[PDB]
Design a protein around this nucleic acid. Sequence first.
RNA 1: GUAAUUCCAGCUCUGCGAGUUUGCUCCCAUAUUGUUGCAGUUAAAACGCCCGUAGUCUGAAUUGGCCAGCAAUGGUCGUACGUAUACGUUCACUGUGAACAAUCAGGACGCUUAGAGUAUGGCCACAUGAAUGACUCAGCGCAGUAUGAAGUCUUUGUUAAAACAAGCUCAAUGAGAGCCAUCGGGGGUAGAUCUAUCUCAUGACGAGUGGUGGAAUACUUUGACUCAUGAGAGAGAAGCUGAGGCGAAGGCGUCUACCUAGAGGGUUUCUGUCGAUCAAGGGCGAGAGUAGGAGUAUCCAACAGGAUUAGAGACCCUGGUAGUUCCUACCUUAAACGAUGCCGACAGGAGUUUGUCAUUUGUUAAUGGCAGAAUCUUUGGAGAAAUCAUAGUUCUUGGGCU
RNA 2: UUGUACUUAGGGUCUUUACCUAGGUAGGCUAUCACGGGUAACGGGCGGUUACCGUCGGACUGCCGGAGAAGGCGCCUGAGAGA
Lengths: 100, 140, 82, 150, 128
Amino acid sequence: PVKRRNHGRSKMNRGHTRTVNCMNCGRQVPKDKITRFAIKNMVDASSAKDVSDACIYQGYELPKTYQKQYYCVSCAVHRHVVRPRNVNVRRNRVPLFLKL
Amino acid sequence: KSKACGRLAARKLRLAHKSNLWASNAYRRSLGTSIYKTPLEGTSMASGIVVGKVAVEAKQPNSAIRKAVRVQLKKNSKVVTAFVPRDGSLRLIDDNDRVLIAGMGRSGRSVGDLPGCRFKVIKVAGFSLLALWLGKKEKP
Amino acid sequence: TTLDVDILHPSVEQELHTNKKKTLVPNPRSEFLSLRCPSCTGLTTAFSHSNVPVFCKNCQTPLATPTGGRILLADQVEIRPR
Amino acid sequence: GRLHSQGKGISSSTCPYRRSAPHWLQLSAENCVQMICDYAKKGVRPSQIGALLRDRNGVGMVRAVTGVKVLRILKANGLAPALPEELYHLIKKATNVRKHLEHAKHDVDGKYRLILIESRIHRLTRYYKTRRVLAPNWKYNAQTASALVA
Amino acid sequence: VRTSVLADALKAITNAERRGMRQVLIPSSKVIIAFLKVMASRNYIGDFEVIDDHRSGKIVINLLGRLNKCVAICPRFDVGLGDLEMWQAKLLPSRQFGYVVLSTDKGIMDHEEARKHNAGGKILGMFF
RNA sequence: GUAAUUCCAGCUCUGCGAGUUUGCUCCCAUAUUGUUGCAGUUAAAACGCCCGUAGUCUGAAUUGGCCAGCAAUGGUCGUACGUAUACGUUCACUGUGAACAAUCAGGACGCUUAGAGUAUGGCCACAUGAAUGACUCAGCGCAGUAUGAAGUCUUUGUUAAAACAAGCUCAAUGAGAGCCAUCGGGGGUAGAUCUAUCUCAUGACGAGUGGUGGAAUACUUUGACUCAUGAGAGAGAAGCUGAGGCGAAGGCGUCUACCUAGAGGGUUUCUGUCGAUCAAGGGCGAGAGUAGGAGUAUCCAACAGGAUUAGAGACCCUGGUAGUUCCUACCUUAAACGAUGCCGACAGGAGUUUGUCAUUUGUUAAUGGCAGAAUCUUUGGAGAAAUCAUAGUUCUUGGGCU
RNA sequence: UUGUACUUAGGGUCUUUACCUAGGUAGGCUAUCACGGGUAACGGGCGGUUACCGUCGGACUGCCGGAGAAGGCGCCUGAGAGA
């Protein structure tokens, strides 16, 4: 039977959509069907205090890298970006974070 | 809904009905005829001369050899296997006799364990097997 | 209150809120406005919705100008109910 | 807009509930017959004629003045158009879009919408030939398109 | 397209009665007004208001809450007195209530009327 | 398959009974042939989409109200004043009437009963009965007009000058056309633009670079790999990009000018049913594929090596032509999927959101209207269940077509 | 579909007609299924099965009407026969 009302596709009203690539498989997948906007620090954390001794320009702001990430279901599951879950909490369409 | 309901629409209903009968397998089997190219020829009972005696065996799970005679028919001059019921009975039949054959009683198809043959021997020599098996009539 | 609604004699609110056609008598929401530029003293009739940009006899500039719905009243101009 | 289309429209005028009136305004039965015939001399289609009276002479329903619809007034005086107005506009549209499909022939959306106008006309021309406005022998071709609009 | 009115309108009245409304809004006609009138005589319905809009019309029913289905069957089959008492057995649930509105030559009236007048005709539907 | 409640025998018991099994054909069982009366999201089953003829289907409107009702009817309100006591549309449909053996149903009668048969019953010469209905669609007559049809040549019709109020309804949350201000990756043509990749030329350096789970084939001091500038080529438009928009579906994302289509909204514009759905028939139709030109950067069926493996015609790696791009002809298929045909009505709340209008100075907003697009739910009903505001209104069975 | 469809004149017949022979037109039937093919097809009153609707069978059917006398074909006699 139908697992999801969505069918794993987030597209309504349109016959066709563009393809992207999971970063690991390199697989061609439609855009509609596991994206993450990803901010990491360019130096690191424990590297950063060793660096800031040797910096020309005082104080400074050590920059951040940005990356929009596209996966695919096979790639997403293997990396634990997504997992399977119980039939009741499949419906739960919000992420893990929660606020008051 | 899902069909024409209107007052003047009886040609659509009558003509569409004639098409849908050809899906039904019983109308299809009767009409094709389609039955003539059969050993029986559409006749319940047929007779003719025995060629010999053959052992054909059951499928699975039933391990047993069944003993069906080969019989040439009178009217077609074809040959066809035919089961012999009751224990003994192959011994009662004799070689090169006339026998009366009839159907397996399944309205076609192949019946029990026994594949292939669709035919049982009702009489031999104008007597009947039940009488012979029971032994209230005789053969020379 | 799904079961009880009084629909023979509804409120004055509910007639305005429902669609042009959906009312118990269907009849439109659009009327002929009287108009006046403070330049002239000549009192000009117009259809509120229009299609055509409205002029008085005397001046030159349109009194009202066309959009989708109601007329867009250019300048200081006013309406006398008659 | 339901005919050659996916979509369920509902958007149009609704006539006022009372055909008669209004006494408050001021118009005449004889004077309005002149004004309709005024514009029809200068080559306007009855779809636009009523609109000019609405936006110049505050005439809501023209029937509600005269007792008579606009096309009857022109045919009474004996000076309507020869083609119906809805038919005139479609063949004038269809000759223009066929002029485009000469120039660049790749737009199949032009071709798909040439049909669905050319189709609309053949429905209407049947209807008008039943009412005996156009004679049986009248036709619409590519060669005869520009002769009829002109 | 609206193929039929009397067919359509009696669906809407039934959907009110299942739900248990007090009143319903039906484009009106002269068979629908007579069909509602005949079931008003047998007291299945309250009392209703056939309003003007220089148009097709509207009706506002007032429901009494005593009614299970209005069918309106089509196509409109001809029926003639000797033939009729089949169409009671098919269409109605019981024998002991529920009526079969048919347009007799005299007018549209129940089966119970129609056999009294000795006039059959084409049938519209039923109610029970 | 050596403990047989189904074999072969005995004994007891059961059924039906002058009957009782066994073949083939055939109806019921079977709403598994569906007019009544099936089913089509996933079980078999909705054409890939749009036009479209035959076909079937086709909104409202026309002589009634009121009183006595138990109906048939009979009075009153309205006078509408043609033929000159009968004539002023025909049908379909309904009632009634004509017309047209046995069997079937059914009346009479104790053939001793029954299946049958047309008889038979009264002691004084008599009385009878051999009905009626159905068989039945078409064709024929009179009577009734609720529903459903046809009848109704008008830039002026019917019996010079008349008369008929001469006349052609409404303006449907049917449809078409017009007009107004918006909206959108609807389609086409042409030119720029932005990095990226590859190639080539110049300079710098000086042993590896690639690639992998690990390696090797591969390119490298005739200087690759990285770094910098410069020129060319063909392909593509990142991020914004979303359960967002448009398009009949297939499908459609830089910017500019050009020709082109239309949905939705608003409308006291116009016409007046012009419409719904569709065998044939006609076009559009992803990607692959074919034919002929123009290209050829990337990636790459085949193919060639290298690994791994028992083998590896594969998965992994290095190279690679056809194709991938443009133009002219073709092909006509996909999980062309909402696996849900199209038009129409009604039935429940809740807040999202796209377009646009309305009343407000909550004006890039609030509330409400139509038209989209999804969603949620302790709601009803449906379903085999999964689930579904349609897959609901369906043994409480009939809106219209395929 | 080529006497195939109409028309005018004739022959022939118990009469009417392409029934047949002439002259003159070029027509008729067809998606409301023509034409062609198949039938384990004589038609009908009716019979079997059934809750209704239907459905299968109908040589016989205790009757009605048609056709045939081993296979075509032809003819006399007669009110009537291709016996």
